[PDB]
Amino acid sequence: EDIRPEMKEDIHDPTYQDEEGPPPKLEYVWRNIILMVLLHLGGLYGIILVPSCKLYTCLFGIFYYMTSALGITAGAHRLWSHRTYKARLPLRIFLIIANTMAFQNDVYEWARDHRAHHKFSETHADPHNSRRGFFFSHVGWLLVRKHPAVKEKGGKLDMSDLKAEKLVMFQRRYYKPGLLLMCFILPTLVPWYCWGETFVNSLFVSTFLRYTLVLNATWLVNSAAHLYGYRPYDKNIQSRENILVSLGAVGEGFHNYHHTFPFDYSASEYRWHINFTTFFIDCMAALGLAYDRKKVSKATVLARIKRTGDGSHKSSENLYFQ
Ligand SMILES: CCCCCCCCCCCCCCCCCC(=O)SCCNC(=O)CCNC(=O)[C@H](O)C(C)(C)COP(=O)(O)OP(=O)(O)OC[C@H]1O[C@@H](n2cnc3c(N)ncnc32)[C@H](O)[C@@H]1OP(=O)(O)O
Ligand SMILES: CCCCCCCC/C=C\CCCCCCCCOC(=O)[C@H](O)CO
Ligand SMILES: [Zn+2]
Ligand SMILES: [Zn+2]
């Protein structure tokens, strides 16, 4: 059925394929390459600095990880890219601040790539085309120029819903000072001042390592979740169910389900099963900050499993009622 007719720019289009001849060579962006290397070097140095950190520093890092995660999953992903539920201003203010902490480009840019990632999955119009391998879909696409198909096909996507949202456009306008404050400055000064953590530890652990972990956990949804796992809902696509990815990406590891039903607010068959994001949204709904949560019916899901499933769903039947 059509449970979300307000938006259809994330529906997979099997019609579009790569038929423009041999693909052009990759064009390296050395500025991004250098910065990405230095970031992971600093993050690695943070790991060996963890045992010398205070308890609050480690706890603050986890808190900042989880909050930033919600900014991507509950906000950039399920809310603004897919429109799977409606959030009121206080929650949207939280999510837009949380998203800014995560530093994965502004919401508008994030959703524009993501809608293209769903419509033209596994093609040259897919920003993280998994056909190019693990490395490209993981981080490689952030180091090279986008394929012309991304710009052309993606440019035909409707983004007017995000253009008309004042909060989204507000973040885009002031994204540079925002990301500097929320992703680098504040999470470094807070441990430095509040519980007397050293500046070195706060910089490499509470900022560099944390941000590095958020990135790679997110990137695993593009790489690992497109290569390893089962496909209980649709075997014809490359999206996979990955439990480990769900743990790291607070519930975004059920990727086979999600690509099959991009309009589901839980991004999974079961709501709270290894899905902290859905649990968060449901809590917000209890407070009256969120509503119009769209869940695919059991009948539709069960019928799709019969039609295009790989047969691995038999082991996950009747886990929960919801
Ligand atoms: C724990 C949390 C777990 C969360 C799990 C959530 C899972 C969700 C599902 C998986 C998705 C997750 C993916 C998100 C992760 C990636 C985010 C980051 O890492 S970012 C990390 C930090 N951020 C970074 O590191 C940034 C690094 N990236 C870059 O520097 C560049 O983007 C580039 C070098 C990669 C491409 O360079 P280049 O080829 O020169 O292309 P340009 O970009 O410069 O575009 C210029 C023009 O092209 C046009 N156009 C482009 N795209 C589209 C489109 N999709 N459509 C239409 N048009 C498009 C447009 O006109 C644009 O103009 P304008 O918008 O300016 O007006
Ligand atoms: C207590 C001692 C800690 C020592 C290390 C501190 C490192 C500080 C730096 C970054 C924090 C990383 C936290 C990642 C949590 C991911 C599981 C998140 O998973 C979940 O919340 C659900 O399982 C997902 O559905
Ligand atoms: Zn995907
Ligand atoms: Zn999605």
UniProtKB/Swiss-Prot annotation:
Free-text remark on how the cofactor is bound: Expected to bind 2 Fe(2+) ions per subunit, instead of the Zn(2+) ions seen in the 3D-structure.
Gene: Scd1
GO BP annotations, alphabetical order: brown fat cell differentiation; cholesterol homeostasis; defense response to Gram-positive bacterium; fatty acid biosynthetic process; lipid biosynthetic process; lipid homeostasis; monounsaturated fatty acid biosynthetic process; positive regulation of cold-induced thermogenesis
Pfam families: FA_desaturase
Localization of this protein: Endoplasmic reticulum membrane; Microsome membrane
Motif (Histidine box-1): 77-82
Chain segments annotated as transmembrane: 30-50, 55-75, 175-194, 199-220
Binding site for Fe cation 1: H77, H82, H114, H118, H258
Name under which the protein is recorded: Acyl-CoA desaturase 1
Histidine box-2, short sequence motif: residues: 114-118
Membrane topology designation: Multi-pass membrane protein
Tissue-wise expression: Detected in liver (at protein level). Detected in skin and liver. Detected in sebaceous gland, but not in hair follicle. Detected in white and brown adipose tissue, eyelid, Harderian gland, and at lower levels in Meibomian gland, eyeball and adrenal gland. Highly expressed in liver, and detected at low levels in brain, heart, lung, stomach, skeletal muscle and kidney.
Cofactor dependency: Fe(2+)
